[model samples]
Target chain A: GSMNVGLVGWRGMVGSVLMQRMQEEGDFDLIEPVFFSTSNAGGKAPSFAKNETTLKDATSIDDLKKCDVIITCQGGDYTNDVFPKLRAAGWNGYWIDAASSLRMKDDAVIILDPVNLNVIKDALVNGTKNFIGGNCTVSLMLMALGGLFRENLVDWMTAMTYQAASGAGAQNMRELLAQMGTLNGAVAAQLADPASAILDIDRRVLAAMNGDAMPTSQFGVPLAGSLIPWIDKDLGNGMSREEWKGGAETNKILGKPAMGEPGSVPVDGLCVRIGAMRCHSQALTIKLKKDVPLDEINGILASANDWVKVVPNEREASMRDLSPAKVTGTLSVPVGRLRKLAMGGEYLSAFTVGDQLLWGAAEPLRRMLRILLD
Target chain B: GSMNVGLVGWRGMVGSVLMQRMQEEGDFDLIEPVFFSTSNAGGKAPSFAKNETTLKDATSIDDLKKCDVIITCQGGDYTNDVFPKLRAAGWNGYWIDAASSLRMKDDAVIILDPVNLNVIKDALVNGTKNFIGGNCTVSLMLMALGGLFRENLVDWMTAMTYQAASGAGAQNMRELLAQMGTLNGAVAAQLADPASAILDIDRRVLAAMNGDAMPTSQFGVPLAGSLIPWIDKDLGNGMSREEWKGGAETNKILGKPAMGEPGSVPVDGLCVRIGAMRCHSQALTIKLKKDVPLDEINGILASANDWVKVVPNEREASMRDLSPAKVTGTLSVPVGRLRKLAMGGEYLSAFTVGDQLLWGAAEPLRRMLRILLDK
Candidate 1:
C-alpha cells in the first residue's frame, strides 16, 4: 500500500514549487495525498492532486495525526505552532519541513540527498523523524562543492554571495521588478536619445532609485541598479546570520564537526543581494589542505553530481554559460572562473551559479519524500 | 598672460566630463582655449570656449605644436598616430593625456595629484613632459586607500570589481540600457500582474536576454540583469589585462617598486562587469602588515582625501551611503562594508564605490591641469 501524505502550505512560493516538482515527477500517483490550508480550508484542491477534495484545517492536530508522513512549506511560524503540539500529543508520523525551525535540532536531519544521502540513510535507520531543507545559499554551495568536501580537501572556504530576490520572499521579487521598472521609466526618454549625456541619465536614475518614486516597502531600500552588502540579522560578532549559517548548516548537512571544533573545515563570507530574480551566484575563495592540480580539481567537481556542470575558464564559454542569465530556470549548477590565486597554489578561486528555487529550496524536500516512499 | 591650451576630443564622454569640470572651475580664465577635432574640424566650437571660434585640425601637428599645452582625450589611436610625430618635430610644451598610450613609458607620469602630488612635482622638476591619467579603477582605488599606502601599512591586496558599463565605453552604456529595456519590456505585463508567476517572468526575461530580442553587439552578451566575470583582453597566464593593470598601474602611481620586486605590494584579483551605468564598485580584501583595529582603519581612510567618505560598517549607513546608486554622478568615493575577515585580524575586507568618469577617468586629467597652472 502507498503512504498517506499530508501536504501543508501548498500555496506559497516554495510550496508551489514543491507541488510542481512532485507533479512533474509523477510523485502524487504513489501517495494518497491530503492538502491542508491555514486560511483557505474547505477550498477546492489543486488539479494536480489527482482527486476532487477540499483542503482540511491545517491547525487541527487530529487531521495531521492520521497521516503516515507530513511535509510542510508553511514557514517557521506554522511549523513552530503546529509541529510541537502534534508531537506532544503522542503523534509519531514522519515530519518533513522547509523551514529553519527544526533544522539544527539533534532529532532533525537537514535533507540534501545528493550531497549527503549517506547521512540521510543513516538518519532514517536511526529513527530521526524530522528532515528539514537547508538554506538556499548553503545548499547551493554544497551542490557545487560537494566533491571537495566529500574528499576532505577543503581546509577553509569563503563565499562572497550574489544572492537573488526570491530568497527574500514573493513580495520582494515583485518589489525588485517594480524598482527596475521605475528606474527604466525615469530615464526612458534620455536613454532613447543616442547622444544624451550618460551622466545626466545616471543622475536621473539615481534619483529615482533613491527617491520616493520607486517602491521601497519590501527591501527597505533600492536594489535595482545597486546591491545590498548585508543579508539576515546582525549576529553581534561581525557576522550576519546568513553568513553564520554558511558554516553552521554546511557542517550539519555534511555530518561534520561544528565550526571552530577540531577537524572541522571553516566556511564563512559576506552575502550580498543583487537584482537577479531567482539565481544565486557566489565568488568563492578556498584554502585547500594541500596543493591540488587544476585539472584534478575540475575532475573531482564534475564527478560529484549529475547536475554540476564544470564550465571552461575561457572567456567565451564563461560569458555564454557561467552566468545567472543562463543558469536561471534550469537545474544545472555551473561553476567556473576556476584559477589559483596569486597568494599561492593552495589558494583557489571559483565562481558558481544556481537556481535558488530548484536545488536550493524545493528539490531536496521532494527527494526526501522519495526516500521515505522507498 | 594666459597659456594657449588646445583641447582635442572634447565631444567624447571623458572629454565632455573634463570640459564640464574645467568650466565649472572657471579654468577658461587661466587659458586661451583652442578647440580641435578630426571629424568636425573648421566647424563651430562649443559655447564653453569663452570666445566664438572655429575648430582646428586635430591631426595637423603644426596646429597642435603651436599650443603652450595640449590636452587630448582623443583616445589611444589618435595619441599613437600623432604624439610621436609631434615630439619628433621638437614641440616640447606639456602634454596632458587621457589615453593609456603613454602612461607606462619612463618619460610619462600617471597623474593622480591628490595621492601623488609630490611624485608629480618631482617629475616636473626632472623634465617629464607626458602626464597621463591612470586607469579609472586604479585612480579610484588610490583615492580611497591613499592613507594606508601613504602610511605604508599594506602588505598585499585583492580587488574583485563590480565595474560599470562606462568603463567599456559610452556605446556600451547605451547598449546596457537597451538590454535592460528589452528585458523589462518582455516581462512588463507579467510584472504588472501582482499574482503573476516569478518563474514565468524569469523565463521570458532570460529568453529575451539570450535570444535576439536584446542588443548584444557592444557587450557580446546580455548584461542587463546578469554580470560578466571577465573584462578586457585575456593574458596568457589566466589573468585578464584589466586585472593585470590593478597591480602594474597601482605601483607605478604610488611610485613604489614594480610588483615582484622587494618593497613592492602585490595587487591582483578578478574583475567583473555589472549593470551600473558609470559608477564602479570594488570589494577589496587587504592583507595588512599588522593587525589594526577597525576605528583606526576608518580614520586612515577618511583622511586620505577631501572626498573620501568612510561610511560606517553598520547596515543602515552602508545601504544608504555605500552603494553605486548613491555614489554615481558625484565626486564622493565612499568606502564601507569594513570588517575583518575570518582568516585573521590582519585580513581586512572593505567595499568602495566611485564615479568612474569623474575620479576614475576625467578628474585626474582636470586636476593635473590645475597643478601645472599653479602660480
Candidate 2:
C-alpha cells in the first residue's frame, strides 16, 4: 500500500528544496505528499509532483491525521510547540524532524541512514518513534568523511568550515546576496579602474559594515565580501554551539551500542560563514588510529560510497574549482586535495564541498524516510 | 646634505604606494626626490610634496647616477636588466631594492627596520651593498608575529595566508575587483529572490571561471567570489614558491648570525590568495617552545610594538573588522581571535591582517631608508 506524507514548512527554503528532491526522485509514484500551511492559512499552495491538491491548515489535527508519516523542516520553536499537541491529540504517525528539537531524546534517533543504516534498520524493526536530522555542517562533514569512521580508521578530527549562505536558511542567503548586490552595485563603476578600486571597495565595504543600512537581522553582521568566524550562538566555552555540535551530533549519529560502544572522535575547530550561497566547504585535518597511506584513503572513499567523488586533482581542487557555485544542485560531494600531513603518517588534510541543502539537509532526510518505507 | 633619492617604478602599484608612504612620514623632507619612468618617457611627471619635477628615463644611466640612493620598486626582470648596467656605468649609490633578486644574495640584507634594525645598521657600517625588501607575505607575517620571535618565545610556526589581490600588485588587485564586479553585477538583480539567487550566482560565477571574457593575465585564474589555495608558481615539492619563501625568507630575515645562529624555527603552510584588495590576512597556528600563558603572549605584543593592535575582542573580530578593508591606509597590523588549540596548551591559533601596500610592500622600505639617512 502507498503511504501519505505530510510536509510542514512547505513554503520555506528547506521545504521548497524537499519538494524538489521528492519530485526528482519520482518517489511520488509510491508516496502521496500532502502540503500544509502554517502562516498562509486557507491560501492557495503550489501543486507538487504534478498532482493538484488544496492546502490544508497545519494547525488542525483533522488535517494532520490523514498522513501516515509527518516530515517537518520548520524551525525548532514550531516543532517544539506542535509535536506535543499532535501526540496529545493521538496522532501517532512517524515524526521525522529536520530541526534539532527531538534529536537528543532517547527515543528519537539522529538519522544519517547510509553511515548507520543497519542501526536505523534495527530501530525500525524495534518501532522507534521519533527521528531527527543531524546538523547540516556535521551531517555534511560525516557524509564526506564517514567512510573512514565506518572502517574504524579515524582517531580524531579538526575541521575549519567555510559555510555557505544557505546554512542560515533562505532569509540569510537573500540577505547575503542583497548585501553583495548593494555593495557591488554601489561601486560597479569604479571596479573597472585598477588604480582606485582597492581603496574604493575597501572604503565602501567598511561603510556598509558600520552603517545600519544593510541587513544584519539574521547573520548579525554583513557577510558579503567578508566572513564571520562565529556560527550559532556562543556556549560560554571557547567553542561556539555549532563547533560543539560537530562532535556531539556526529557521535550520536554514528553511535551504535553493538560496536563495543566505541566512543566519539574529538571534532573541534572554527566554523565560519563565507559568501558562497549553497555549498559548505570544510578543510578537515584527520588523525587516524592506524597508519593509512594516502592511496588507501582515496581507495576507501572510492569503494562503494556512491555519493562521494574523490577528485584528487593534482592541481589541488580549490574554492574556485569545487565551490557552491558548481556543486549546489547535485547530490555529489566532491572531496580532494588530500595530502598526508608532515606531522605523522596517520595525519592527513583534505578539502570537501557539499550542497548544504541537498546532501547536507534534505537528501539525508529523504533517504531516511526511504529506508523506513523499505 | 640630504640624499637624492631616485624612485623608479613610480607609476606602478607598489611604486605609487611607495611615494605615498614616503610622503606621509614627511620622509620627503629628509631627501631630494627624483622620479623615473619606464613607460612614459619624457612625460611631465606630476609634482610631489608641492614641487614640480621632470620625469627621468629609467634606462638612462645619467638620470640614475644623479641620485645618491636609487630606490627601485620594479619587477625582478627590471632589476636583472638595469642594476647590472648601472653598476657597469660606475653609478654606485646605495641600491635600495624592493624586488626579490638581491634579497637572498650572500651580502644583501632583507630590511624591516624595527625587527632587524641593528642588522641593517651593521650592514650600513660594514659597507654592505644592495639592501632589498622582503616578500610581501613574508614581511607582513614577520611584522605581526615578530614580537614573539624577538622575545625568543616562538618554537615553530604554520601559517595559511588569506592574501590580498594587491599582493600581486595593482594590476592584479584591479583585475580581482573587476572580476568581483562582473560576477556580482551579473546576478545583482536576482539576489532578492532566494530560490533562484543561490544557483544563479553559482552558475554565473562558474561561467566566469571557465569563460575567457574576464582577465586572468596576472592571477592565472578568476579570484572574485572564490579563492585559489595555490599562490605563485609551484616549486614541484608540493609547495609553491611563495610557501617556500615564507619559511626560508623568515629564517633569513630574523636570523641572528651573531649569536652563532640561535637556529631557525621551522615555518611552513599553504599560501592562498583571496579577493581582498589591500591587506593580506594570515591564519597562523603556532607552536611555542614552552607553554606560554595567553596573557603573556598578549603582553609581549601590546607593550612595545606600536604597530600591532591586540584585538582580544570578546565577540571574536573577523576579516571585516580587522581586514585591509578596515585597516588599510594605516600602519597597524591588527591581530586577534587568539585561542589555544585543542592539541596542546603550547599551540595557538591567531588571525592577523596588514595592508600589503603599506607594511607589506612600502612602509618598511621607507623606514629602512630613514635609518640610512640618520647616518
Candidate 3:
C-alpha cells in the first residue's frame, strides 16, 4: 500500500492545490510524496499531508530516481529537460505530468480520473508508465458533461467560456483581485459619500478598466470587472490556442480518432477570460447526433458521475446559482440554464461552472498519482 | 430656436445624466427648460443650460401644461397619475415618457432615434400626442446595431445580454460595486499575505457572493463576481418579461406586425445580468434575409451612423475594452467580435456594448425632446 512519488513544481498554484487536496484526502498513507522545486530548493515546505519535507532541486535526477513515480507540475521547459534525462537514464518509474509537454506524445496518455479511468487504468496496467493531465478547461468541462460523450450522444459541440483568473496562475489571480480592489474601493467610497456623484464613480471605474496605469501586465488588460474574449496565444484564423486545445484534448481524452480521421466527434468553442477568481464557466450549445429528450440528457449527466451535478432548469438555476462564485471550490459542475433551443431536437443550450484548479488542474494529478499505490 | 420644454425626474441618476448631457450639448436655448419633481417640489435646482429653475411638482397638471412637450424620467406611477389627468384636463401637449408603463400602448411610439425615427416622426407629424422610450436593453441593443434592422438586412435575431447594474437603478449600481469591494478587499488581503491560503480566500469571496448575511437584497442575490441570467419579472412561460421584451420591442420598434401576425421577424435570446456597473454588453447571432459578405456587414455598421464603432476581431473589443465601464457616459456602442458562424452565409455573430442609462434609457427621451424643439 506504499508507493514513493516525487512532486515537481510544488511551489506553483497547481502544486499548491495538489498538496492541499492530498492532505485533505488523507490518502497519503497509500503513497509517500517528496516535494521538488527548481527555485525553492533546500527550502522547507510547511507541513503537508501529515508529512513535512525539505524541497529538493528538481534538476537533481538522482534524487528523483528514488521515487517509483514522478509527478511534474513544473512548466514545459523544466519537464522537457528532466523527463528526457530520466527516460534516457533507464528510470523505469512512472512519469506523470501536469504540463502539456508530453500530452500529445503517442506514447503518453492524459488522465482525468473519472472520465477515462478505465482507459488510464488499462494503460498503466499494460505497462504504459508515461501520463499527462488534460488542459484545465478541457478536463473540467468533460468532467461535467463527459458522460454524454461517453454515451455517444453528442454529435458536435460549441461553447463560449468565461474562464477564471486562477486558470492562468496564482499571480494572475492576485493581479485580478488587485484590479478589482482599485475599481471597487473607488466605487464604494463614492457610493458611501453624500457629496460624490455616482456618475463620477462609474467614470473612475471605467478609467481603471481602460487605463494602462495599473499592473495588469499578466493578462495584457485589467481583468477585475471585465471580460477578455481571447485566451491563450493567438493561432490566427480567429481561433486561440486555448480554443484549439479544448476540442483537440476532448477528442484525445475521449479516445476519439485524431483530426482528419473518421469517427472523430467535433468540439468547437471560444475561450474567454472572465473575472472569476477560481471557477471556469462555459455557455455551451451542443448538437447531438440523435434527438434525445431533455430529461434523458439530465439523467445521463447525473448518472455519468457523482461529480456532475445537474441543476435542472425547473429549479430555475440561474447565473447567481451556478456561477463561479457559487461553485468554485466544489468538484461538481453546477450545470443549469438548460433549454432545448428553437434550433430543434438535437440542439441544446446549457451553462456550467467548475473549479478549474481542483477538478480541472490539480485533483486529477493528485488522484492519478495515488493510483500508483494500487 | 424658441420652444418650451419641461424636464421631469432630473434629480435621479438618469435625470442627473440628462442634465449633464443637456448642459454639455448646450443646445437647450432652443427651448424654455423647466425642472419638475414631486418629492423635491419647491426645491431649487442649480443653473442648467443658462436657466436656474425651481423644481415644480409633476402632480401639478397646471405647471406641466406650460410646455409644448413634457419629458419624463419620473417613475411609471408618476406618469400614470399625471398623464391621464393632464390629457383629461384638455392638455393636447406632447408626452415623452421614459417609463415602461405606456411603452407597449398601441398608440404610443417607441423612439430609438435612428432605427425608428421615421416611424416616430410620421406618427408625431400626423398629430400623435403620446410617445414612450423603448426598454433600456431593447433600445440599447438597437441603437448599437439597429441599422441592420432598418436596412432590412436582418431576417431574424438572437442575442444574449450581459447587462450592467445601472440598468436597474443607481442603488443597484452602488450595491454591485459594494459587493465587488467586499469580495475584492478580502481577496487582496489574502493574496498579499504570504501565509494565507488561496483556498480560504476563494471561500470568502464566494461567500460574499452567495452568503445571506450580506446586503444583497437589492438584486435578490449577489451580483459582484456572479451573473444573473434572469432579469425583470418572470412571466410563467420560462421566459422573463425582460427576455420577452427583447423580441417584442424589437418587432414593435422595427414596425413589424404584432405577435402571431404574418411578416414578423423572430427575435429570441437570454437576458443575463453581469457585474458591469455602467454599460450593458450583448453577444448577438443574427441571420440576414440576404447573404451579405462579412466585409459588407462591417462596412454597414461603421458607415450606418456615428455612434456605432466597428471593432474588427483583430482589435478584439472585450468587456474591459467596450463595456459599460468604458461606454457608460458616451453614446457609442463598441461592437466587435464579428464572425461568420458555421451556420452559413446568412448567419453571423457579433458582440456590442452600450450605456443602458445613456442610449438605453435617457438619451432617446432627451433627443426626442430636442426634436420637438427643431420644429
Candidate 4:
C-alpha cells in the first residue's frame, strides 16, 4: 500500500485501457498513484488518480525516480528513450512495460499470470525488474490453449489470425470505421433498394474502397469489406515480424526453450488483419502427440482458466458463443469449432476468439502490479 | 446456330448472372432461346431472349422436350421433381444444370470448360446427358491452382475458405448488408467522435448484432463485422458438407481418382463465411511433391488459364490486386500472397480470390452451352 507507482502514457489507446482496468479493479486505492504525461505536464489528472497535485513530466528521470514501480504504456519509442536513461541515472525501481522493446530481452520476464503465474512468481523472487506483456495474438493463444501446453500434448501448431484493427493502434481503428462508413455511404441507396443488383452494389463498394472517397491513411488499404493477408513488417525470412513473435514470445511466457530448441513446439502461420474492432480470432491446426478424445480436450481447456469457455462443437453453440461479436469487450475467451481433421485423429482443428485488449494487453500489466503489491 | 436452348429460373441470382454473361458473350446470337418460368408461364421474355414468343411452362416436359438443350438454374427441388419425369418419358435432350442434385451421378459431367473441357468433351462423346456446374469453391480453386494441378505437383493441400454472402442466397446478401447497416447505425455517433472510447462503441455494436434490431433470419447469426467459422450442414464425419466438397468435387473436376485412391490428392480444410458480398477468398497451404522454384511455380500457375493472374508476391501488389475488393466484378481470378511457408520449401502458401458468381457458377454453364452450339 505504501508503494509510489508512476504511470506513463495514460492517454493513449492501450494506456487508456490500462487506466480503465486499474480504476475498475481499485488498484489506485492500494497505492500512491502518480500520473505522468509527456505533453500535459502540470495539467489536471483524472479523478481516479486521487490527491495527485499535478501531472508530472513523464520525461523527467528525477520525477519518475521517486516511484517504487513505474509502468509505461507509451509504446516502444518512449520505452527506448526513457527506460535506459532512468536506470542509467542509478534508479533501481521496477519497470513494467506494455511495449515489446524489452519483452525478448534476456533479463525481462513477459507477464501473463493466468498461464505463467509461476514464471512471474519466480521472476519476483529472482529480483527481475523488467516485466512486459506478450504479443496480443500470442497472449490470447496461450490463454485459450494453455491447457494443451500444460499437459505437454502439442507437437506443433499453426495459427492463422483474424486480427482486429485495434491491434494496429487507435487511429487505425478509426480508419477502419471510416472506410466502412464510406463504403456503406457510397452504396446506401442501392443497399436500401431491394431490387438493385447485388453485383452492381459490389462494384460500387469496390470502387469506393479503391477511390479517393474512402480513408486509407492508416491501413494503406481498405480493411472493412476486405482483408489484408499480412500484418507487421517483413522479417526477410518468409515471415512477418508479427508472425515471428508467435513462437518466440509464447515460449518466453511459458519459460520453455526458444523455438527450434530440443523440446520447443514449432509455431508458424499467416497473420491476417480483418474488420473486427477489438477481438482477435484465430483458426488453429494443432498436431497432438497422441489422439486425445474431444471430451477430454474440452475439460483440459475449460479447467485452465476462469475466463476460458469451451464452446460445444455443435453448430448452434458455436454460432452463439464463438465469434468476435459475442467475445468482443468481454473477458470470455471462447474456443469452439473443435474437430479432428481428415489427416488423423491426432490432428485437431479449433477456432478461438478473445478480446485483444483485456487478456492481450491491459489485464496482464494490471495483474503484475497487484503481484508486486503483495 | 440452329440449337434451341430452353432456360429455366431466369429471375433468380445465378440465373440472372448466367443470362447476363450469355448476353455479353452473344450466346443468344447462335441459338434460338426459349425462356421458361414456373410462376409466370405467359410473361414476356427478357430483351436478350430475342424474338421469343412467350415464357414456357418450366414444368411442361412436353414443351421442354422440343428444345435441343435444357438448362435449369431452378434449384435442386425443381430438378428433383421434373428432371426424372422428363427422362422417364423418353425425352433425352441435353440437360445442363446449375444444381448439385445430379453432380455426383456417374453419367453427369461437372462442367468447368477452362479446367475440365476435356472431361466435358469426353462425356459428351460417350452419350452422357447431364452436365452440372461444380461447387463454387471447388471451381474457383481449380481456376486459381490449375497450374500446379496440371503439372501433377500437388501431394496434398488445405484450403481455408473466406466465403462471401452471395454463396448462401440473394436474401442472405441483403441480410448481411442490413446487419452491417444496423451495426454501423447503432455506433454512428460514437464512431464520428474520435475521443469516444472504442470499447464503448464495440459494446453498442455487439448489442445491435445480438438484439432484435438486427436481421438474423437468413444466417441465424451476425456475419457483418464478424465471421462464421462453419458453413453448410454437418456431415457427421467431423466435416461440414461444404468442406467435404473441397476434396470430392476438386478430384471429380480434375478427372482424378476419388479421394483416398491411389492417384487422388487429398484436399481438406475449414470453410468460413465472411462479410464480403460475392467474392470467395481462400488461403491455400499446398504440399508439393518436390521443391519447385518460386519463379517456375509462378510460371506454371500463370500459364494455367487466361483469367488466372498470378499476382507478384510483394506487399504492394498483393494489397492492390489480390483481394475481394479488386477481384469482385471482373473475371480475374488472382492468386497471390505466394510464399514458401516456414514449414519448408515443399510447403507453399498461396491466397486466391474469385467472384463466386462468375467462374464459380454462371460462366461455366454459359460456356458449356457454347460447347454444345459448335454444330
What is the C-alpha lDDT profile of model 2 across B214-325, one tens digit per residue?
6677776666655666677655444567777876788788764321134767666666666666777776667788888888888876664678878763454553465544
Could you tell me how far off, in angstroms, the CA of residue A315 lies in candidate 2 after the best superposition?
A: 3.4
TM-score of 2: 0.88
Chain B TM-score for each model?
0.98, 0.91, 0.94, 0.98
Residue lDDT tens for model 4, A1-374 = 68999999888878888988898889999998999988889999877877786899999989999989998889999999989998899888889998999999988999999899999999889989999999999999999999999899998887878889889987787677677677777778987887898767766777887898788879888787888877888765456788889889878888999876878887877788888888999888788999999889989999998989988776677777888888877889998878887667897888899998889988898899999988
The TM-score of predicted model 3 comes to 0.89
Cα lDDT tens digits, model 4, B58-97, are 9998999988899888899999999999999898899989
Scanning candidate 3 chain B in windows of ten residues, the lowest lDDT window is B315-324
- The stretch of ten residues in a row with the least summed lDDT in candidate 2 chain A is A256-265
Candidate 4: residue A219 Cα off by (Å):
1.5
Candidate 3 residues A1-374, lDDT tens each?
45777888866778778877877887666777678767777888556623537887789989888888887777889988888898889899998888888888888888987899888888877888888999888888897888889999887766667778887887787777777777876567677786877778878887776666666778777666666766777665556678778767888888888643578776755566767778887767677888888788888888877788887564345645677667767777777766665446776777778888888888888788767765
TM-score of each: 0.96, 0.88, 0.89, 0.96
lDDT score, residue A140, model 2? 81
Extract clashing residue pairs from model 3.
B279-B324
Task: Give me the chain B TM-score of candidate 3.
Answer: 0.94
